[PDB]
Homo-oligomer: A and B are copies of this chain.
Amino acid sequence: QDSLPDTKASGPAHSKEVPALTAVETGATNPLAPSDTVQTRHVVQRRSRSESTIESFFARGACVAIIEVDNEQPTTRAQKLFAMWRITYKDTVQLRRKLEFFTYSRFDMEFTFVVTANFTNANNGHALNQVYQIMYIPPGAPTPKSWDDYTWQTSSNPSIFYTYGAAPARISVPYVGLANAYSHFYDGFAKVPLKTDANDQIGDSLYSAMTVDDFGVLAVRVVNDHNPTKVTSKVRIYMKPKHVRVWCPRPPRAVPYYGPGVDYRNNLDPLSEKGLTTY
C-alpha cells in the first residue's frame, strides 16, 4: 500500500480551537484538511502518488541534441565529414526546465541514439549501408582534426559503432560528477581577480560557469568511405536520468531561456490579462 490518507468523518463544532486561523509570517503552510473547516464523511482513500515520485517524473527519454554528419567526397573547404557536440541538457528546453525544479541532483544517465539518413541530391547512383562511430572524448583527450585521423583509433575512449537500420543504440553512464551532487545552479566563479594581477583579464571568468569543458564531447562520424553520391545523416540524442535523487526545490523557469545561465532577455510577460472579479 501507498495510498493517501483517508478522510475522517467530522461533525459540527463550537470551540476555542481555531484551525482556520493562522499567521503565514512564520514561514509555515497551515496543515489543514477538509474536516478542519467543513463537516466531512468517512472516505476510504485509494488514490496514490506513484506517478509523481522523482523517478517517475524524470523516467522518460528526452531529446537533448540533433547532431548532423555528412558522408561525401572529402573535398577541401569546411565540411561535415565528422561532428562534435559538448554533452549537455541545455541545448534543448523541456528536460532543462524539469531538472531545474531542483538545485542539486545525483543520478545515472541512459543515452539512446536515433539515426536517420537521406539522399541529398536528385541522383548519382546509390549508397551501401552506413556504419556510424560515436566516440566519447573526455576533457584532456586529443580531439579529431580529420574524419579518419588517429584519434578515431579509440583505444581508451569509449566508442559506439552503430549500423544504420538497426534498433536505436543505447548505453548507460555512471554518476560522474567531481562533487557529491550535480549543481544545476552555481552562484560563483571559476577564477578570482587579485589586486596583484598583471592584466585584469588573468582573473576574469564567466558568472555561474564551473569547468571549461564540463563533461567533454561526443565526436560523430560515418566510418564508411564516401559513395559518389552524398548521404546526409542526423543523430538524435535522447537522454534519461535514472536512479535519481534531488535536493533543494526551486521555482520553475517562467520566461524564455537565454543561453546556459539564468539570463533573461525578452518575453518577460508570462501572465495573461484577467479581470479581478471575473471567473
A98 within 8 A of B: yes
Name A residues whose Cβ lies closer than 8 Å to a Cβ of B: 60-63, 92-95, 98, 114-131, 150, 152-159, 161, 163-168, 223-229, 231-232, 234, 236
Do residues A60 and B158 form an inter-chain contact, with CB atoms below 8 A? yes
Shortest distance between the CB of A62 and any CB in chain B (Å): 4
Do residues B163 and A167 form an inter-chain contact, with CB atoms below 8 A? yes
7 more contacts with CB within 8 A, not counting A61-B159, A92-B155, are A60-B157, A62-B155, A117-B129, A119-B127, A119-B228, A120-B228, A123-B124
Known: A122-B228, A168-B161. A116 touches B94 (CB 8 A): no
**Partner of A94 from B153, B225, B228 at Cβ < 8 Å:** B153
Do residues A150 and B93 form an inter-chain contact, with CB atoms below 8 A? yes
Do residues B131 and A114 form an inter-chain contact, with CB atoms below 8 A? yes
Do residues B92 and A153 form an inter-chain contact, with CB atoms below 8 A? yes
Do residues A163 and B161 form an inter-chain contact, with CB atoms below 8 A? no
Known: A60-B155, A227-B119, A228-B121. A165 touches B168 (CB 8 A): no
Nearest to A64 among chain B residues (CB) is: B153
Shortest distance between the CB of A69 and any CB in chain B (Å): 12
Do residues B116 and A225 form an inter-chain contact, with CB atoms below 8 A? yes
Do residues B121 and A122 form an inter-chain contact, with CB atoms below 8 A? no
A-B contact pairs, 5 of them (CB 8 A): A60-B157, A61-B154, A94-B156, A121-B228, A163-B165
Do residues B122 and A118 form an inter-chain contact, with CB atoms below 8 A? no
**Partner of A225 from B118, B121, B150, B157 at Cβ < 8 Å:** B118
Shortest distance between the CB of A138 and any CB in chain B (Å): 12
Shortest distance between the CB of A65 and any CB in chain B (Å): 10
Residues of chain B lying within 8 A (CB to CB) of residue A123: 124-125, 228
Do residues B119 and A125 form an inter-chain contact, with CB atoms below 8 A? yes
**Partner of A114 from B60, B157, B161, B236 at Cβ < 8 Å:** B161
Do residues A225 and B234 form an inter-chain contact, with CB atoms below 8 A? yes
Shortest distance between the CB of A51 and any CB in chain B (Å): 10
Do residues A223 and B153 form an inter-chain contact, with CB atoms below 8 A? no
Nearest to A120 among chain B residues (CB) is: B228
Residues of chain B lying within 8 A (CB to CB) of residue A128: 117-119, 127, 164, 231
